Design a protein around this nucleic acid. Sequence first.
RNA 1: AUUCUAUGAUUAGUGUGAACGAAAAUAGAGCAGCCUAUUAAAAUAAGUAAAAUGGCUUUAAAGCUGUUUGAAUAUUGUGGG
RNA 2: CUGAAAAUUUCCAGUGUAAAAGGUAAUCGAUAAGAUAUAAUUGAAACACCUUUAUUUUUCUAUCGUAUUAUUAAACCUUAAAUUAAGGAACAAUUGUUAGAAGACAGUUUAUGCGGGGCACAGGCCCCAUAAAGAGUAAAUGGGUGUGUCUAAAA
RNA 3: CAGUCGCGUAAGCGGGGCAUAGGAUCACAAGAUACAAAAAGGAAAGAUCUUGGAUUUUUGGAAAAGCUACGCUAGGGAUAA
RNA 4: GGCUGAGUAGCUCAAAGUAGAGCAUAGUAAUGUCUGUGUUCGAUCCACAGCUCAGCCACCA
Lengths: 150, 48, 195, 74, 39, 56, 54
Amino acid sequence: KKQYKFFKSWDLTGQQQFSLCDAMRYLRAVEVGQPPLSVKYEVHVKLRTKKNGPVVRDRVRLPTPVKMDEYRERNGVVRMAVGQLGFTPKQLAENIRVFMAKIKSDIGKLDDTTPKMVEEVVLSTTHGPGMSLNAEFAPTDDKIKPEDLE
Amino acid sequence: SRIINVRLISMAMTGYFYTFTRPRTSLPMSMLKYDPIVRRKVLFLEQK
Amino acid sequence: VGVIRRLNVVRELLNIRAGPGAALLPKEVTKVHMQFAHRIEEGHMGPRKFWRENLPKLKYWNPAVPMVINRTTDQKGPAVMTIYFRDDKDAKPSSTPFPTSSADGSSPAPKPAQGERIVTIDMKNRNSSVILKEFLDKTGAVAVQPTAKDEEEFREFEDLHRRSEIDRERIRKMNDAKKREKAMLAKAMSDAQSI
Amino acid sequence: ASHRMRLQDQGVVVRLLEDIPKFGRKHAIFRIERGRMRNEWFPKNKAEYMTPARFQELGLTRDAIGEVDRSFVI
Amino acid sequence: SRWDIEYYRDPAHRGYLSHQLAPGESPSLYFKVPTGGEK
Amino acid sequence: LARRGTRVLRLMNNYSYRETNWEIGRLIGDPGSVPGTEKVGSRKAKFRARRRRRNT
Amino acid sequence: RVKGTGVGEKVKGHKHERTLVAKMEKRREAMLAMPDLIREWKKVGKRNWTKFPK
RNA sequence: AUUCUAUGAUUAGUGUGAACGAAAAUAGAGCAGCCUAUUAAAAUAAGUAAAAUGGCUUUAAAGCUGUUUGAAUAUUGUGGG
RNA sequence: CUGAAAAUUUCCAGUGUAAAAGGUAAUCGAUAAGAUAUAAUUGAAACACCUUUAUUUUUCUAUCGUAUUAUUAAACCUUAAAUUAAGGAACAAUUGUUAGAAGACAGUUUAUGCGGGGCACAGGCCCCAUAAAGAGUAAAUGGGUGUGUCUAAAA
RNA sequence: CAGUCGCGUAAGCGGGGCAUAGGAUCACAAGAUACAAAAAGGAAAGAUCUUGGAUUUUUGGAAAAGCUACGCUAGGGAUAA
RNA sequence: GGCUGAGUAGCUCAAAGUAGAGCAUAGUAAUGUCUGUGUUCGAUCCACAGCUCAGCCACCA
Ligand SMILES: [K+]
Ligand SMILES: [K+]
Ligand SMILES: [Mg+2]
Ligand SMILES: [Mg+2]
Ligand SMILES: [Mg+2]
Ligand SMILES: [Mg+2]
Ligand SMILES: [Mg+2]
Ligand SMILES: [Mg+2]
Ligand SMILES: [Mg+2]
Ligand SMILES: [Mg+2]
Ligand SMILES: [Mg+2]
Ligand SMILES: [Mg+2]
Ligand SMILES: [Mg+2]
Ligand SMILES: [Mg+2]
Ligand SMILES: [Mg+2]
Ligand SMILES: [Mg+2]
């Protein structure tokens, strides 16, 4: 009977976000031995958008190829790969900034009636858990440092 | 109710405007008027 | 799909940092290699559980060492793992050539360099336990101990599964009771039409 | 939601001098309704008001106030 | 105040605070003299 | 390009430098005609192009 | 040490003074696009025009 | 410090209007400071300051106030204006 | 849409109750077999598994609200020097706030013009005549179906 | 007169309509100006310019129904029988 | 001035995998989603803009 014009927006005050390097440490372990060429990351970005508004149907040419890439908003979220398993944090980092900017550039390019603002950024693999992403990049643990490997 | 008072806003973003009346059952107004701020004739368009 | 839903589903899958198989390997080790078959036959179930249960716990505390796997379809293939234990007293050799994982045996065990001495460990028709202990005692490494917060993580999710299984059967008893009831209603409609 | 709401009292802080069932153990500090404390507990000497002076003598601070334990059992 | 300071801070009025200024500085406490050139 | 790219900042009131609105107006062109209304092309040139496109 | 005019303090500036450079730039931008706006308005025509401020 | 008179002032300001109407300051009359008050009184002030609401006063501040709520601890910058 | 556990998404065809998209070719089977999935078939769309979202439904929890019941188990109220008494009872009552509401009561308005006043009608503006060859010129004087508009110019 | 636009070969013409028929302040609202800013930096609320909404129709601009034969006062042959 | 809810057979009313049943019209038959523009395989349905509107606050200076 009741109806709302918005997508459910949960409270993030108690969320546990991870830095990009701290996250890959968790993911690279679950993908031990998996073919890096057949295991790629993925990002789901929840947007504070209204159901009535339009949708995004633009394309993006990332710096490094993962397969021009195509992305589309289906329901208050946008899902697309961002890098293979063998991607180093330096390469994977900019590979994400190019995706968020192309979005925020298309949002501002859109109408001002309901500017769709981002709420959270998730990161997962083809066999990994969905973990939240923090704006930070470096690991919180002082013992670990940027390390690249298979 | 048949005639409304409209405001033609300057497209030079100078804040000057001209006010004219026109029937509701008509198209918006658009004119080439003189802007006293920049002292040049620019294009004025209806506010709404 | 609330934030706490995704949060509990994650923190439970974060047992990678736990007691079972986690340990801080020494800097003497350089890299690891393993090769086993796809299926579980002719003594091949041991390595599989070692790959899905304890092996991931090493890369968390040892994210610098490359641990690669080479699967194959030959079920009789030798399920053996090599450990490049010797790094030449940490001489830091230039071991640039090294393969990558695969699924058809395309990345076999390469020959070690001059400053590397591998350590063979066979595993066939043997349990992961005997295979695990053989890895730690041989590759001398200190086992990390969990913190009290980790004990709560195990205790919390453990008590959670009690509530879950208590609900899995409960909701199951309402659906089957309905399925049965809905089927009973349909039978009456079909029977009534026959009359 | 609004920028101003109806002002409400949260209760009075008291330290139980006995061990009342269904609220808390002895020497338990929490915020209880003024009615129960004023009419039932204080006359029967079941609790005492935790005035700022009382906090000093007992050595505790205002950051020691607990919550009511409805599940408490004797 | 701002106005009273700026008045006696400029050399045009021979303000007694003008000595605190540099040759390139402006009397105003908020505005600055822009730079000429192409860049 | 040089004219439209120039910015003359003139001393005004309260030690403020800004571009005068009238100078901003003369950037597009000199006064006398409204820029944009003048026809850029010539009818004769348009006739020559029409024949060229037909010849080819 | 009073606000603004005190030692180490900086004058905030009036609102019309803070947005003075951001105001003349908007006016300058609109004039540069004036010839292209009148060309698209004299070609499209007064009736077929559909772009209006909001 | 308080009090009395004049100027400030048919001013600031308020109010649709009619009208109402300060203070600083200045001059004069008086002059006195204190808590051990020259008559016997503080262990330095909490339901208090303040807020919302209904009113008074009023220039929207400050001040008074019924109802419902409700702080902090000294220039080493605490509290009021 | 307070959150948590669990579950649910049927046009024909389709192995069958396909929620949607994105990623993937292996996943499960303690060592012996086979079940899933991919393939192929069907369809607009093809499935395991890992993710992020959508719809709906239970219990728990949070909130709000109604109805009822109990209460020297010292709220309050009533009789009562006024009590471990009797009864009512979270009502009533009082305070503050809010809405509705009796000329019951109070203040004030209800005008002026007009061949006396009452009833009635009347109040600004435009054209013509009366108006006496400059201009002006009255009357509850004569004419008028007069007037509170229209109008961006183009297909 | 200055500014800068249209038409015209040109002279020149254009500050709405062949002429004669509908309102202010105040308050409010939308733009500009950069004046002042109650210690100071800002701001609020003000000031100037442009513009809009009025049977403000008692239209130089009050939010407004009656009876008195129970009647009262001040005046008026300036008024009726 | 400002938001909100509605529009389908001639007339009534219904209903994202449909347009139904009455009455009217000629026992037997036929009758339609305000309009344009979008999304999704597909829209009475979701969305956007108008048209008609009604309803509720506000200007009434
Ligand atoms: K006050
Ligand atoms: K009783
Ligand atoms: Mg209360
Ligand atoms: Mg005055
Ligand atoms: Mg004191
Ligand atoms: Mg007070
Ligand atoms: Mg104050
Ligand atoms: Mg005070
Ligand atoms: Mg009366
Ligand atoms: Mg005459
Ligand atoms: Mg005459
Ligand atoms: Mg008229
Ligand atoms: Mg000031
Ligand atoms: Mg008059
Ligand atoms: Mg007049
Ligand atoms: Mg009689």
